Coordinates of C-alpha atoms in Angstrom, one line a residue:
Chain H
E2 CA 154.2 181.0 83.0
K3 CA 150.9 181.4 85.1
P4 CA 151.0 182.0 88.8
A5 CA 151.4 178.2 90.6
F6 CA 153.3 177.8 93.9
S7 CA 154.3 175.2 96.5
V8 CA 155.5 175.8 99.4
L9 CA 156.7 173.2 102.0
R10 CA 156.7 174.2 106.0
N11 CA 158.6 171.2 108.2
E12 CA 160.8 172.4 111.0
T13 CA 160.8 172.3 114.5
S14 CA 158.5 176.0 115.7
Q15 CA 155.6 175.2 116.9
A16 CA 152.4 177.2 114.3
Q17 CA 150.4 178.9 116.3
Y18 CA 146.9 178.8 115.8
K19 CA 144.3 181.3 114.2
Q20 CA 147.7 182.6 112.7
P21 CA 148.7 182.0 108.8
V22 CA 150.6 179.5 108.3
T23 CA 155.0 180.3 107.6
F24 CA 156.8 177.6 105.5
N25 CA 159.7 177.4 105.6
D26 CA 161.8 176.1 101.2
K27 CA 159.6 177.2 98.4
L28 CA 159.5 175.0 95.8
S29 CA 157.8 176.6 92.7
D30 CA 157.0 179.8 92.8
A31 CA 156.0 181.5 89.5
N32 CA 154.4 184.8 89.5
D33 CA 156.6 185.3 92.9
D34 CA 153.0 185.6 94.5
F35 CA 153.2 183.1 97.1
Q36 CA 155.6 185.4 100.9
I37 CA 156.3 182.5 103.2
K38 CA 158.1 185.2 106.2
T39 CA 153.6 186.0 105.9
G40 CA 152.0 182.5 105.1
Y41 CA 150.4 184.3 102.5
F42 CA 149.6 184.3 98.8
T43 CA 148.4 187.8 97.3
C44 CA 146.9 188.1 94.1
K45 CA 148.4 189.5 91.9
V46 CA 146.3 188.5 88.4
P47 CA 142.9 188.1 88.2
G48 CA 141.0 185.2 88.5
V49 CA 140.2 181.7 89.3
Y50 CA 142.6 179.4 90.9
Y51 CA 142.8 176.7 92.7
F52 CA 143.9 176.2 96.2
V53 CA 145.3 172.9 98.2
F54 CA 147.1 171.5 101.5
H55 CA 147.9 168.4 102.2
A56 CA 149.3 169.4 106.7
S57 CA 150.7 166.1 109.6
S58 CA 150.3 167.2 113.5
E59 CA 150.8 165.5 116.4
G60 CA 146.8 164.6 117.9
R61 CA 143.7 166.0 116.7
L62 CA 144.3 168.2 113.6
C63 CA 142.6 170.8 112.5
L64 CA 143.2 173.9 109.6
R65 CA 141.4 176.3 108.0
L66 CA 141.2 177.9 103.8
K67 CA 140.6 181.3 104.3
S68 CA 141.3 183.8 102.3
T69 CA 140.5 188.7 102.1
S70 CA 138.5 188.2 99.2
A71 CA 134.8 189.8 98.8
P72 CA 132.8 187.8 100.5
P73 CA 135.6 185.9 102.2
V74 CA 136.5 181.9 102.2
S75 CA 135.9 180.3 106.0
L76 CA 136.6 176.2 105.1
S77 CA 137.2 173.7 107.8
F78 CA 139.0 171.0 108.1
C79 CA 139.5 168.2 111.2
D80 CA 141.0 165.2 112.6
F81 CA 139.2 164.7 115.3
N82 CA 142.1 161.6 116.3
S83 CA 143.6 160.1 119.1
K84 CA 146.2 162.0 120.9
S85 CA 149.1 159.5 120.4
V86 CA 148.2 159.0 115.8
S87 CA 149.5 162.0 113.8
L88 CA 147.2 161.2 109.7
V89 CA 147.1 163.8 106.9
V90 CA 144.3 165.7 106.6
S91 CA 143.7 167.1 103.1
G92 CA 142.4 170.1 102.3
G93 CA 141.2 173.1 99.4
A94 CA 139.4 175.2 96.9
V95 CA 137.8 175.8 93.9
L96 CA 138.0 180.2 94.4
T97 CA 138.1 183.3 92.4
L98 CA 139.9 185.5 93.0
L99 CA 140.5 190.3 92.3
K100 CA 143.6 192.3 92.2
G101 CA 144.9 191.7 96.4
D102 CA 143.4 188.8 97.3
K103 CA 145.5 187.2 100.0
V104 CA 144.4 183.1 100.8
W105 CA 146.3 181.4 103.5
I106 CA 146.2 178.5 105.7
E107 CA 145.5 178.8 110.0
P108 CA 145.5 176.6 112.8
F109 CA 142.7 176.7 114.9
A110 CA 142.3 173.3 117.9
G111 CA 138.7 172.4 117.1
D112 CA 137.8 171.1 120.2
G113 CA 139.4 170.9 124.2
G114 CA 139.7 174.3 126.4
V115 CA 141.6 177.0 127.3
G116 CA 145.4 176.8 127.6
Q117 CA 146.4 175.3 124.9
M118 CA 149.9 174.5 123.9
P119 CA 150.5 175.1 119.7
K120 CA 152.3 172.3 117.4
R121 CA 154.8 171.3 115.6
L122 CA 152.6 170.6 111.8
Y123 CA 153.7 169.5 108.9
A124 CA 152.5 170.8 105.9
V125 CA 152.9 171.4 101.8
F126 CA 150.3 174.4 100.1
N127 CA 150.2 174.5 96.8
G128 CA 148.4 177.2 93.7
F129 CA 147.8 177.5 90.6
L130 CA 145.4 180.0 87.8
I131 CA 143.1 178.7 85.9
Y132 CA 142.4 181.7 84.4
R133 CA 142.8 184.9 84.2
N134 CA 139.3 187.2 84.7
Chain E
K3 CA 148.7 168.9 77.7
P4 CA 149.8 166.3 79.4
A5 CA 146.8 164.3 82.3
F6 CA 147.3 162.0 83.6
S7 CA 145.1 159.7 86.1
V8 CA 146.2 156.2 86.6
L9 CA 145.4 153.2 89.7
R10 CA 146.1 150.6 92.0
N11 CA 143.7 148.3 92.9
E12 CA 145.6 144.5 93.2
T13 CA 146.3 141.9 95.8
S14 CA 149.9 142.9 95.7
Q15 CA 151.7 143.8 97.4
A16 CA 153.6 147.3 97.4
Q17 CA 158.5 147.3 97.8
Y18 CA 159.1 149.1 100.2
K19 CA 161.2 152.2 98.0
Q20 CA 160.2 151.1 94.9
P21 CA 158.0 153.2 92.7
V22 CA 154.0 152.2 93.5
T23 CA 153.2 150.1 90.3
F24 CA 149.6 150.5 89.2
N25 CA 146.6 148.2 86.9
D26 CA 144.1 150.6 84.4
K27 CA 144.9 153.4 83.2
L28 CA 141.6 156.1 83.9
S29 CA 143.6 158.5 81.5
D30 CA 146.5 160.2 80.1
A31 CA 146.8 162.5 78.1
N32 CA 150.3 162.7 76.1
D33 CA 151.1 158.7 77.4
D34 CA 153.2 160.3 79.9
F35 CA 153.0 158.1 82.4
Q36 CA 153.3 154.0 82.1
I37 CA 152.1 151.7 85.1
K38 CA 154.3 149.1 85.0
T39 CA 157.7 150.6 85.7
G40 CA 155.2 153.8 88.0
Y41 CA 157.3 156.2 86.5
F42 CA 155.7 159.3 84.8
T43 CA 158.2 160.5 82.3
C44 CA 157.7 164.7 81.2
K45 CA 158.2 165.5 77.7
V46 CA 156.8 168.5 77.9
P47 CA 159.3 171.1 79.8
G48 CA 157.6 173.5 82.8
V49 CA 155.5 173.4 85.3
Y50 CA 152.7 170.4 86.8
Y51 CA 151.1 169.2 89.1
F52 CA 150.7 166.5 91.2
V53 CA 148.4 165.2 93.3
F54 CA 147.5 161.5 95.2
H55 CA 145.4 159.6 97.2
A56 CA 146.3 155.5 98.7
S57 CA 144.7 154.0 101.0
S58 CA 146.6 150.5 103.6
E59 CA 146.1 148.6 106.6
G60 CA 146.4 149.9 109.0
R61 CA 150.6 152.7 108.8
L62 CA 151.2 153.9 105.4
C63 CA 153.5 156.4 104.4
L64 CA 154.1 157.7 101.3
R65 CA 156.6 160.0 99.7
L66 CA 156.2 161.3 96.1
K67 CA 160.1 162.0 94.3
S68 CA 161.9 162.6 91.4
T69 CA 164.9 162.7 89.1
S70 CA 164.7 166.2 88.9
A71 CA 167.2 169.1 90.2
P72 CA 167.5 169.2 93.0
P73 CA 165.3 166.0 93.1
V74 CA 162.1 166.3 95.2
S75 CA 161.3 164.2 98.0
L76 CA 158.0 165.0 100.3
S77 CA 157.2 162.1 101.8
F78 CA 153.2 161.5 103.1
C79 CA 152.8 159.6 106.5
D80 CA 149.2 158.7 108.1
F81 CA 150.2 156.8 111.8
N82 CA 147.9 154.2 112.8
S83 CA 146.7 151.4 114.5
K84 CA 146.8 148.3 112.4
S85 CA 143.0 148.0 112.8
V86 CA 142.6 150.9 110.5
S87 CA 143.0 151.2 107.1
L88 CA 143.0 155.8 106.4
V89 CA 143.2 157.8 102.5
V90 CA 146.1 159.1 102.7
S91 CA 147.4 162.0 100.2
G92 CA 149.5 164.8 98.6
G93 CA 151.3 166.4 96.4
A94 CA 153.2 169.0 95.0
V95 CA 153.9 172.0 92.0
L96 CA 156.9 171.0 90.1
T97 CA 158.9 172.9 87.7
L98 CA 160.6 169.7 84.7
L99 CA 162.6 169.3 82.8
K100 CA 162.8 166.8 79.1
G101 CA 163.3 162.8 81.1
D102 CA 163.1 164.2 84.3
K103 CA 160.1 161.0 86.6
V104 CA 158.0 161.4 88.9
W105 CA 156.9 158.9 91.4
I106 CA 155.2 157.3 94.7
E107 CA 157.1 155.3 97.5
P108 CA 155.6 153.4 100.2
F109 CA 157.8 153.7 102.9
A110 CA 158.6 151.9 106.2
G111 CA 158.2 155.2 108.2
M118 CA 156.6 143.6 106.1
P119 CA 154.3 145.0 103.2
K120 CA 150.4 145.6 102.3
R121 CA 148.4 146.0 99.9
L122 CA 148.1 149.2 97.9
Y123 CA 145.4 151.1 96.7
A124 CA 146.8 153.8 95.1
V125 CA 145.1 156.7 92.7
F126 CA 148.4 158.9 91.5
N127 CA 147.3 162.2 88.7
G128 CA 149.3 165.6 87.1
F129 CA 148.7 167.7 84.6
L130 CA 150.4 170.4 82.8
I131 CA 150.2 173.7 83.7
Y132 CA 151.8 175.7 82.6
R133 CA 154.7 174.8 79.0
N134 CA 158.3 176.5 79.6
Chain X
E2 CA 136.9 181.1 80.9
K3 CA 137.1 178.0 81.9
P4 CA 134.9 175.4 84.1
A5 CA 135.6 175.6 87.1
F6 CA 134.0 174.9 90.2
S7 CA 133.4 174.4 94.3
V8 CA 130.9 173.7 96.5
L9 CA 129.9 173.6 99.3
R10 CA 127.7 171.1 101.1
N11 CA 128.0 172.8 105.5
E12 CA 124.1 170.9 106.6
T13 CA 122.2 169.0 108.8
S14 CA 120.6 166.1 107.0
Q15 CA 121.8 162.7 106.5
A16 CA 123.3 161.9 102.9
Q17 CA 122.2 159.3 101.7
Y18 CA 123.1 155.9 100.2
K19 CA 124.2 155.5 96.4
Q20 CA 122.6 158.3 95.3
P21 CA 124.8 162.0 94.4
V22 CA 126.2 164.2 97.9
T23 CA 123.4 167.4 96.9
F24 CA 125.2 170.6 97.5
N25 CA 123.8 174.1 99.8
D26 CA 126.5 176.8 98.7
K27 CA 127.8 177.6 95.4
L28 CA 131.1 179.1 95.9
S29 CA 132.8 178.8 92.4
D30 CA 130.9 177.5 89.0
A31 CA 132.6 179.9 86.6
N32 CA 130.5 178.1 83.3
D33 CA 127.4 177.2 85.4
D34 CA 128.1 173.5 84.7
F35 CA 127.0 172.6 88.5
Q36 CA 123.8 172.0 89.9
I37 CA 124.2 171.7 93.3
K38 CA 120.5 170.2 94.7
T39 CA 121.5 167.7 91.7
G40 CA 124.9 167.1 93.0
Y41 CA 126.0 166.3 88.9
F42 CA 128.3 168.2 87.0
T43 CA 127.1 167.7 84.0
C44 CA 129.5 168.3 80.6
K45 CA 129.1 171.2 78.6
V46 CA 133.2 171.9 76.6
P47 CA 134.5 168.1 76.1
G48 CA 137.5 167.6 77.7
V49 CA 139.6 166.5 79.3
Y50 CA 138.9 167.6 83.4
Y51 CA 140.6 167.2 86.6
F52 CA 138.1 166.7 90.2
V53 CA 138.5 166.4 93.7
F54 CA 136.7 166.5 96.8
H55 CA 137.6 166.8 100.4
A56 CA 135.4 165.8 103.0
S57 CA 135.0 164.2 106.9
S58 CA 131.2 162.4 108.5
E59 CA 131.4 160.9 112.4
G60 CA 132.2 156.9 112.5
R61 CA 133.3 155.2 108.6
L62 CA 133.3 157.3 105.3
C63 CA 132.7 155.9 101.8
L64 CA 132.8 158.0 99.6
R65 CA 133.2 157.3 95.1
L66 CA 133.1 158.9 92.6
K67 CA 131.1 158.2 89.6
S68 CA 131.1 159.4 86.5
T69 CA 127.8 158.8 82.8
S70 CA 131.1 158.7 80.8
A71 CA 131.6 156.2 78.3
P72 CA 134.1 153.6 80.0
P73 CA 131.8 155.0 83.1
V74 CA 134.2 156.3 86.4
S75 CA 133.5 154.2 90.0
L76 CA 136.9 154.6 92.1
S77 CA 136.1 154.3 95.7
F78 CA 138.5 156.5 98.3
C79 CA 137.3 154.9 102.0
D80 CA 138.4 156.3 105.9
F81 CA 137.9 152.8 108.3
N82 CA 137.7 154.8 111.8
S83 CA 136.5 153.6 114.5
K84 CA 132.3 155.7 115.5
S85 CA 133.9 159.0 117.9
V86 CA 136.0 159.9 115.3
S87 CA 135.3 162.8 112.1
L88 CA 138.5 162.7 109.6
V89 CA 138.4 164.3 106.3
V90 CA 138.8 162.2 103.4
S91 CA 140.2 162.8 100.4
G92 CA 140.1 161.2 97.0
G93 CA 140.1 163.1 92.6
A94 CA 140.8 162.0 88.8
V95 CA 141.8 163.0 85.4
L96 CA 138.6 162.5 83.4
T97 CA 138.0 162.8 79.2
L98 CA 134.5 164.0 79.0
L99 CA 131.4 164.5 76.1
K100 CA 129.3 166.9 76.4
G101 CA 126.3 166.2 78.4
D102 CA 128.9 163.0 80.7
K103 CA 127.6 163.8 84.5
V104 CA 130.7 163.4 87.9
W105 CA 129.8 163.1 90.9
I106 CA 130.8 162.4 93.8
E107 CA 128.6 159.2 96.2
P108 CA 128.7 157.4 99.5
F109 CA 127.8 153.9 99.9
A110 CA 128.4 151.1 103.7
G111 CA 131.7 150.5 102.9
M118 CA 122.8 154.0 108.9
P119 CA 123.8 157.5 106.8
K120 CA 124.9 159.7 108.6
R121 CA 124.9 164.4 108.2
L122 CA 128.5 164.8 105.5
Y123 CA 130.5 168.4 105.7
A124 CA 131.9 168.0 101.9
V125 CA 133.8 170.8 99.6
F126 CA 134.0 169.0 95.9
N127 CA 135.9 170.7 93.2
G128 CA 136.5 171.0 89.1
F129 CA 138.0 173.2 86.3
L130 CA 138.7 172.5 82.6
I131 CA 141.9 171.5 81.9
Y132 CA 141.8 171.2 78.6
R133 CA 139.1 171.3 75.5
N134 CA 138.9 168.6 73.1

């Protein structure tokens, strides 16, 4: 047994911009490393990890994969499609993490001006240890 | 370790609500996959990673499914115009028992051709 | 420690057709298997590997995962969208590699453009 998780977000609530995506269904979490209420994976086992997400919203969808590791990770994945269209954006990375480092996803508004309302977001976020540091 | 990668690249249409079948096997270390049925069947109980990347012209809805307990049903849809063909990706980390099947199947959220790569491997043994 | 890498292309220059995408930032490379200047992963440890990329470019984007294995891999992933739209295409595979085998991604015309790309890979088991 090693860290391995799969968490799902499927709900009516809008997902706030620039805050960690939270999830309402835990499919797997072997080492109990993920808190679906905060949206954070928190590393207990130091090592190299794989993370990947698959997510959709109506209209433009931008998500960042982020970490509190040093140096920090901030990777953006954006579908700049039309308002009426809903697509699945996927992104992810192989990351080296220390004990206590956090990893999450976060929506942002990749374009447009002030005053945009957050939107519903379907999301599957997956991750697992590749090897122990 | 169980580990596979299978490819659908063909002229036939992919029927709705049936497992996607494949014509090319790139990898199948433990011979867990039958491309003619579209099923991965677990031999080694444990925690697995699964991912697909697929494209069709126009709207494409795919479900990752299992006969594990309780059964998985995860949808991934591109709702785009009929002129546009795009890649939809989806997948999960699943806990499997021996004999559990895992597959992908299209659904309408007139079938079409479907390009698909479906990948999977054991993360750890139970 | 296992072969495991994550490389990032986030720059200005266009990614030419039919040659390996090169990268300007190495996020992870545990076994020093990736050379970002060439765009190649080169296998040192024989075994079964997982490879995956996520990339975006303005308008149409076609990317191909390739290897010099026997037999060689050529797996295409295409987003056939309009000119004013940037989307993320993803693709990948599980591949069996011998020492010296090379793996990479390359753009093709399904007018080159800049390309944001993250390319990841890791050993699943040793052969």
